[PDB]
Amino acid sequence: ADLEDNMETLNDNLKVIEKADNAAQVKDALTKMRAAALDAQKATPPKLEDKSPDSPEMKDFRHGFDILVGQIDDALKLANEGKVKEAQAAAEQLKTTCNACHQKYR
Amino acid sequence: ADLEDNMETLNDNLKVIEKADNAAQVKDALTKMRAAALDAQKATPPKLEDKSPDSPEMKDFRHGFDILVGQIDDALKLANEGKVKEAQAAAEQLKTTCNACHQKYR
Ligand code: HEC
Ligand code: HEC
Ligand SMILES: [Zn+2]
Ligand SMILES: [Zn+2]
Ligand SMILES: [Zn+2]
Ligand SMILES: [Zn+2]
Ligand SMILES: [Zn+2]
Ligand SMILES: [Zn+2]
Ligand SMILES: [Zn+2]
């Protein structure tokens, strides 16, 4: 689940509690709210994306995608020309980049 | 989409390109890979989670959930005693915390 999912879980269960019939129901809803709150707590909300400094490691991580996008663009130009086979070969070269990042950060 | 979703989109579309029928298909796959790469780029990968400082803003953001969990726990104790009505009233007080965070970070 992502932050958005967790908020949906919070909102849904709050409404359940408002319409709740008995203690068991309220307990069940509150328990799920607690877990969702703690999962949401670990996320970076969209409004604070790009507002924090990146570590050297985080900078290198993000740089891997700049490499990948450059290679995707190379393949994309071939696809737009209609060179199916050469676009498929260019895609295969992406795997080098995929693997390099994984080895460091997965 | 979170990082894990984006990687699934990358992996799926890479395989599509390998088995692709035509130029339009390869183009569609590559376009989605480019967007997924750029969406993934904004994430913090799990291996670098506990390795980065939180900004003052990020610290305050996370603190909001500690407040919420404390209030959920207050309501939960009432639910476990069987005080349905008082547990429902305690849940309503959560909304103050919900709203405060939203006003700052949503
Ligand atoms: C500490 C911060 C914080 C608290 C506490 C919090 N929220 Fe949110 N909530 C957010 C942020 C940030 C967003 C925007 C997320 C986004 O843009 O993807 C959000 C979005 C939402 C949304 C929009 C729809 C969705 O699925 O994302 C709803 C509904 C929501 N919150 C409900 C609640 C409810 C109900 C509570 C309390 C029981 C609550 N929130 C408590 C930070 C918080
Ligand atoms: C610059 C970094 C980086 C690049 C580039 C990258 N990956 Fe990943 N990939 C990751 C990380 C980090 C994870 C771990 C995700 C997690 O735990 O949330 C991951 C996870 C995955 C997974 C595991 C399943 C999933 O959905 O998370 C697959 C499959 C995957 N990547 C495929 C690819 C493919 C295919 C490419 C190239 C087209 C690629 N990756 C490029 C960093 C990268
Ligand atoms: Zn999660
Ligand atoms: Zn996920
Ligand atoms: Zn989801
Ligand atoms: Zn969702
Ligand atoms: Zn996304
Ligand atoms: Zn998803
Ligand atoms: Zn998935």
From Swiss-Prot, chains A, B:
Which cofactor(s) does the record list? heme b
Any idea which UniProt keywords this protein has? Answer: Electron transport, Heme, Iron, Metal-binding, Periplasm, Signal, Transport
Residue ranges of the region described as Disordered: 38-60
Q: How is the cofactor bound?
A: Binds 1 heme b (iron(II)-protoporphyrin IX) group per molecule.
Q: Where in the cell is it found?
A: Periplasm
UniProt GO molecular function: electron transfer activity; heme binding; iron ion binding
Which portions of the chain have biased composition (kind: Basic and acidic residues)? 47-60
Give binding positions for heme b: 7, 102
GO process terms (BP): electron transport chain
Q: Does the keyword Aminoacyl-tRNA synthetase apply?
A: no
| Family, as annotated | Belongs to the cytochrome b562 family.
Q: How does it assemble?
A: Monomer.
Function, as annotated, reads: Electron-transport protein of unknown function.
- Name under which the protein is recorded: Soluble cytochrome b562
Question: Gene name on record?
Answer: cybC
First and last residue shown, out of the full length, are 23 to 128 of 128
